[PDB]
């Protein structure tokens, strides 16, 4: 997250932290996700596609820091890793960039909701706020494009939803943005999701409900002039979601 502010997991209790084991045994952060029910985290396929084996992954919930423990945190194994059958990666964009991780502890348990661990609500189908609505993004992603490291402390910032017509203008991304995607950016282009933020929540308050509007998916650099961040448009994947979660 470029710019924005530091935060803690109480702000964003559904934020999931996803890591990948190695052979040598060392563990690296992969991507964020969002806890949509006690057993299910949602995230982005492009995060997993290159190492798609479930046993490689660890999910923490309740976590405010990247590489040190947070009191009250819970650690999960990945019981099922569901990647979208229609994923594609093109010269720019990822399509159908959505993934579900079924989590279960060494104890055989899903999450237990706490002050630091809560679920976030799914939108109503095909229902999204108006362009210019201000929404929040959260992640352990880079603070600057050129950084070599990720921040140890969770961040968030606010961005505004962009109209399709605006995003699909050749000035911006053109054809690359589809109806299954949302754009969002800061008016001065000074705050944004970046590398390591993928799969995390775009949360808007539609009505009075904090609602999971998007999943951080792609964009050219970060906090860059005419280059918004692009997010999977969750309200266009409900059937995929529920079908893969009714189980």
């Amino acid at each position: 997250i470029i710019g924005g502010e530091f935060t803690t997991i109480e702000n964003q209790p559904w934020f999931a932290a996803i890591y990948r084991r190695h052979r040598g045994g060392s563990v690296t952060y992969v991507c964020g996700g969002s806890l949509i029910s006690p057993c299910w985290v949602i995230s982005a396929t492009h995060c997993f596609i290159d190492y798609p084996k479930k046993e490689d992954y660890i999910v923490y919930l309740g976590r405010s820091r990247l590489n040190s423990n947070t009191q009250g945190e819970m650690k999960f194994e990945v019981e099922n890793l569901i990647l979208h059958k229609d994923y594609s990666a093109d010269t720019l964009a990822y399509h159908n960039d959505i993934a579900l991780l079924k989590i279960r502890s060494k104890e055989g348990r899903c999450a237990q909701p706490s002050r630091t661990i809560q679920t976030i609500a799914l939108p109503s189908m095909y229902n999204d706020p108006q362009f210019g609505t201000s929404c929040e993004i959260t992640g352990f992603g880079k603070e600057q494009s050129t950084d070599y490291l990720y921040p140890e402390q969770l961040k968030m910032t606010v961005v505004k939803l962009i109209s399709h017509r605006e995003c699909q203008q050749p000035h911006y991304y053109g054809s690359e943005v589809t109806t299954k995607m949302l754009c969002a950016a800061d008016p001065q282009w000074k705050t944004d999701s970046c590398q390591g933020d993928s799969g995390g929540p775009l949360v808007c308050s539609l009505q009075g409900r904090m609602t999971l509007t998007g999943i951080v998916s792609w964009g050219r650099g970060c906090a860059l002039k005419d280059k918004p961040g692009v997010y999977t448009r969750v309200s266009h994947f409900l059937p995929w979601i529920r079908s893969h979660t009714k189980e």
Binding site: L92, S198, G219, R220
Partner: peptide
């Protein structure tokens, strides 16, 4: 001038 998500201009 290759573009990849995330990183930079080209």
């Amino acid at each position: 001038c290759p573009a990849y998500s995330x990183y930079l201009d080209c």
